[model samples]
Target chain A: SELEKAMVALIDVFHQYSGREGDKHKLKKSELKELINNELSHFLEEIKEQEVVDKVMETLDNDGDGECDFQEFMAFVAMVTTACHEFFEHE
Target chain B: SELEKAMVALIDVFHQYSGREGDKHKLKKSELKELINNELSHFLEEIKEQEVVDKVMETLDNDGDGECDFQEFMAFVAMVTTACHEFFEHE
Candidate 1:
């Protein structure tokens, strides 16, 4: 149940954030900021979380279009999910 | 709230499944089958879902270790997540 719910929640969260601006399918920087700073706070509240989001924007914007599509967002989640898994294993 | 819970649930599910056999950190085929055939059933219940799992095992086992690490699982999740996101967009 949790697994299915998690998948649904992730999809829903991305759509919620991605619909705020142009294209309605991609997340502009401003919209992404709203998402990361709030929804991803615990995962990101490291000292330079905004910088982390900024860095993510640059690294994840593989198309150089300065926006994040769902594909890019999933990649981001994968990274953090993997990283958290490691962190949990160690700590 | 949902976002954080989703991430936690994903990490929890993988760890739950990946620990059943050897390595305690990697998922053997049996472990993966249990995780997928049940946890991921709704997503994979189409025709040849078992075949899909086999195909995924081949594609995702980049190191060819005959087992899946967390990183590979996340990549699988990313692909499905992105695909589902797109499907939702159109329908």
Candidate 2:
């Protein structure tokens, strides 16, 4: 049940940010920036630079669509979570 | 920080199940079976048959190691969560 809760929470969070502007089903750079700035700041330091956001958008925009869909968002989530797992695993 | 919490929860859930047997860093078939039977039952119906678990393990065990490691397991999580997201989006 915890796992399900986590999975749902991730999806809900994406929608929360994704619905703010532009395409309803996708996260533009601004939405992604807000997500990382607010939700992920605890794990990821506050992204202060525009170029950093550009880099992240560049990496995650797999379809080169200038926005992140659910699939790309999941990939980023997986990457960050895996990194977090390894961090605690070694400690 | 809800997103971070979700990410940490997934990693914690994996370790909770992964540490139960054989390899500490990986999940053997039995452990995978138990994880699905227990934690994933809400999202995935309880696996009632051995062949089903074998098929699941076969799908998730990307490296052909007969066990589900963290990376492979994350792929499963991403897939199921993505499916769940779609389900709720349509609802």
Candidate 3:
């Protein structure tokens, strides 16, 4: 089902931006958030309603040490998927 | 906040099992699950009230892959953390 949409947006993000370098298709979490907010507006809209965005901000604020970094952003992607599925399924 | 307890457990896992593999620590989702369920039983017990375990089972069943794997497990960790924080904050 279309319930899982981040993969599609991830593909679009990677393909459209050819300048990405290193082991990851690097994008600042803020930039990535904005891009997802725009291109995947539907999903982003859902996240807002569901309060996923705040969780993401907290997750990406890596270092706890304070402030997000590349690894934390990657981790955030992983976590959000798990959380969302968990939340909805409880109903 | 003590809400972010996963980090503490994760660190304990990585340190205790110094045999982990490259750029990532390789533990089957099932094995990791059991470990957390055991060592972090208190935390796990706490989340049981909040219903975290059930969410984990679902996330690992990724791609309908039918079972939990390392990648899915990592993703689950991320998702669970985010979801937990989000839920608590909403209160």
Candidate 4:
């Protein structure tokens, strides 16, 4: 059940950060940095400064909307997870 | 952060069930059922029949490989999560 809960938790988490301001449906850079730093501090080494934010947001903001919608963020999660899985295969 | 941990946990869980049998990199119908029922019981209401299994598998088996590789399964997760978020917006 943890797995299912994680899925829902993430969406809730995403919304929490994304919903705080501007189009509760998408995530902007400030929200992205806040969400990533607070929610992904350990795994991501924390998103600090503009460069990291740009790179990270650029990776997810496919539509060039300068923000990440749920789909965009979900895409990032899948990609990161898949990449991590790839890492496991080698070890 | 549990978010990142969840990402890693899911991949590991995927590997655990999928690694148990045939093409350690992919998952078959049996593995799918086992994984869904165990990991997604509450959220999904459980997958208990051939029809449901076929439907779920069919939804993810885009290449018709008769099995689900990490990417295919990731696609399913992203889509499912996005749809769930869609529901949350309504409720």
TM per candidate comes to: 0.73, 0.68, 0.34, 0.65
lDDT of 4 by residue, B1-91 (tens): 6567677766776678778886676677777776665766654455435534566577556466657766556545554556443544754
Q: Flag regions of model 1 displaced more than 4 Å.
A: A46-55, A84-91, B47-52, B62-67, B82-91
Cα lDDT computed for each candidate against the true fold? 0.63, 0.65, 0.43, 0.62
Candidate 4 CAPRI category: acceptable
Question: Global lDDT for candidate 4?
Answer: 0.62
Ordered from best to worst TM-score, the candidate numbers read 1, 2, 4, 3
Put down candidate 1 lDDT per residue, B54-86, tens digits, no spaces. 655764476787777765665555555465334
Tens digits of per-residue lDDT for model 2, B16-59: 78887654667877887676657767776634765335555665
Q: Write the per-residue lDDT of candidate 4 for residues A15-42, one digit (tens) a residue.
A: 7777877557678767876665676566
Off by over 4 Å in 3: A1-29, A35-46, A64-67, B1-91
For A1-91, candidate 2 gives per-residue lDDT tens digits of: 7677876777786777777885666787778777676766765567545534566587557577767766566555655455443554653
lDDT of 3 by residue, A1-91 (tens): 1111332333344334313433243444444455334433432343555365666666565534334443344355445534543455654
Best model per TM-score: 1
* Model 1 per-residue lDDT at B54: 64
Could you tell me the lDDT of residue A76 within candidate 3? 50
Q: Which residue pairs clash in candidate 1?
A: none
Better of 1 and 4 by TM-score: 1
**Candidate 2 falls in which docking quality class?**
acceptable
What CA RMSD would you report for each candidate? 4.0, 4.7, 15.8, 4.8
Candidate 4 ranges with C-alpha deviation above 4 Å: A29-37, A44-69, A84-91, B47-59, B71-75, B82-91
- Worst lDDT window (10 residues) for model 4 chain B? B43-52
